[PDB]
């Protein structure tokens, strides 16, 4: 990362809520970037859902993913959210978060590979203990906010030590919004409600790309209640509005 300069005026979309939380916030041509809560943005969550970005990379660059047509089929047993008792392309399972095709990627990529290639990307703590299968989902690997827009501005730029072709087969995979002068790509996650004393974790991460230019951003929070989960979402998109980031 470049410059980061807290801006705490940013904290108005939080108190409104009572939402613990960080916003970081980085425009590429000046190279630096704003967050809400400095001593935040620097400290280490799990992933959650947003692994699925490494983890599609790293599944395509391991081979375990076949190539960008691959379609992973649902075996017609429950699975723990309707939406995902289907077949499903790779950006659909990303789309829709389909824990178990992500699951079963990792479990054939392997702790090798897998520990080799989060190193290879500065992801995080680097720390796979836990299960090969859940190590981001309820193990010991924890990345930052910060950690986050460093990861994506580098997959932006093809710039991960992973083919080109595989960085960009996942970025279409990631398109969210689709305008002629306005593109966004971007992933949700949610670690779940914590335990007493120990909230979890919600995070929405991405870049937007608005004419010549490219923002990248990260938000997380603590959460304890469901309830509360679309703030991951309204908090940035109020923050980014009010930088004039918009369609
Ligand atoms: C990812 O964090 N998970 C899978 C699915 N993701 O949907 S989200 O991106 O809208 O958060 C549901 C939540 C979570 C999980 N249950 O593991
Ligand atoms: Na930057
Ligand atoms: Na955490
Ligand atoms: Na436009
Ligand atoms: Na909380
Ligand atoms: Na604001």
Redesign the pocket.
């Known amino acids: 990362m470049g410059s980061i300069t807290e801006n705490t005026s940013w904290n108005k979309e939080f108190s409104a809520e009572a939402v613990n939380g960080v916003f970081v916030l980085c425009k590429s041509s000046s190279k630096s970037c704003a967050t809400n809560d400095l001593a935040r943005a620097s400290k280490e969550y799990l992933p959650?859902?947003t692994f699925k970005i490494p983890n599609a990379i790293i599944g395509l660059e391991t081979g375990v993913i076949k190539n960008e047509h691959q379609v992973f089929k649902w075996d017609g047993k429950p699975r723990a959210?309707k939406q995902w008792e289907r077949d499903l392309t790779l950006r659909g399972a990303i789309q829709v978060?389909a824990?178990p095709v992500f699951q079963q990627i990792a479990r054939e990529v392997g702790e090798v590979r897998m520990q080799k290639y989060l190193k290879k990307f500065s992801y995080g703590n680097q720390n796979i203990s836990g299960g090969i299968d859940k190590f981001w989902?309820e193990g010991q690997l924890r990345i930052s906010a910060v950690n986050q827009v460093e990861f994506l501005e580098s997959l932006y730029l093809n710039k991960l030590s992973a083919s080109k072709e595989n960085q960009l087969i996942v970025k279409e995979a990631l398109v969210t919004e689709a305008a002629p002068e306005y593109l966004v790509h971007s992933?949700?996650?949610?670690?779940?409600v914590g335990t007493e004393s120990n909230p979890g974790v919600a995070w929405w991460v991405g870049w937007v790309e608005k004419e010549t230019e490219v923002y990248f951003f990260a938000f997380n929070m603590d959460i304890d209640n469901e309830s509360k989960l679309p703030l991951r979402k309204s908090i940035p998109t109020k923050i980014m509005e009010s930088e004039g980031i918009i369609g």
């Open positions: 959650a859902s959210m978060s824990v989902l992933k949700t996650g949610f670690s779940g």
